[PDB]
């Protein structure tokens, strides 16, 4: 744990990137989190929503 | 069947042409909810029930 | 835009509708602005024969 100050910065940046990548898996109230599924399932008036 | 004893039929292992359902004018209401009616020929399904 | 249709087909003169005269007779855009006007004309546009 001698080099914990640099490893803390590395871990924080990697964890922020991992959280940002993980947020793509959330649908945020939509029917799916995948854009291709919405674009292949729905007409543009409701796929827009 | 009556609505209290509504009949559930499994649909599996078939290729389905929904365009004869869209292009027929015999249906007074043809309303789809989680999917567009015209995209039904472009998708694959399981657990289809009538 | 004036035309004559059935009584159940007046729901298809709207943006974002799926239907028969919407696809092959008269289509409204999704960004349509304006007013649709409909009234019954069984006394004028109908004959007993």
DSSP per position, A1-37: -TTHHHHHHHHHHHHHHHHHHHGGG--TTSS-S-HHH
Q: How many C-alpha atoms does C48 have within 13 Å on its Cβ side? A: 0
Q: How many CB pairs under 8 A join A and C?
A: 7
| Structure obtained using | cryo-EM
Entry resolution (Å) = 2.3
Choose among B34, B15, B31: nearest CA to C19: B31
Query: Three-state SS for A44?
Result: helix
Task: List, in sequence order, the alpha helices (H) in C1-49.
Answer: 20-24
Choose among B37, B1, B39: nearest CA to B22: B37
Q: From its phi and psi, is residue B10 left (phi > 0), alpha (psi between -120 and 50) or beta?
A: beta
Give the integer Cα–Cα distance in Å for A47 and B37: 13
Which residues 7-46 of C are in CB contact (within 8 Å) with A?
Answer: 15-16, 18, 30
For C18, which of B25, B28, B37 is closest by C-beta distance? B37
Give the integer Cα–Cα distance in Å for A47 and C32: 18
Chain A residues near residue B38 by CB distance under 8 angstroms? 43
Query: Which residues fall within 8 angstroms of residue A24, CB to CB, at 6 or more apart?
Result: A33
Choose among C7, C12, C14, C11: nearest CA to C45: C7
């Amino acid at each position: 744990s001698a080099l914990g100050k640099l490893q803390d910065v590395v871990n924080q940046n990697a964890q922020a990137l991992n959280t940002l990548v993980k947020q793509l898996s959330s649908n945020f109230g939509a029917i799916s989190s995948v854009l291709n599924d919405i674009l292949s399932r729905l007409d543009p008036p409701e796929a827009e929503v | 069947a009556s609505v209290y004893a509504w009949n559930r039929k499994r649909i599996s292992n078939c290729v389905a042409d929904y365009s004869v359902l869209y292009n027929s004018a015999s249906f007074s209401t043809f309303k789809c909810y989680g999917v567009s009616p015209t995209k039904l020929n472009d998708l694959c399904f399981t657990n289809v029930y009538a | 835009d004036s035309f004559v249709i059935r009584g159940d087909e007046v729901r298809q003169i709207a943006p974002g509708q799926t239907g028969k005269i919407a696809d092959y007779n008269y289509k409204l855009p999704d960004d349509f602005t304006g007013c649709v006007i409909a009234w019954n004309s069984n006394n004028l546009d109908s004959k007993v024969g």
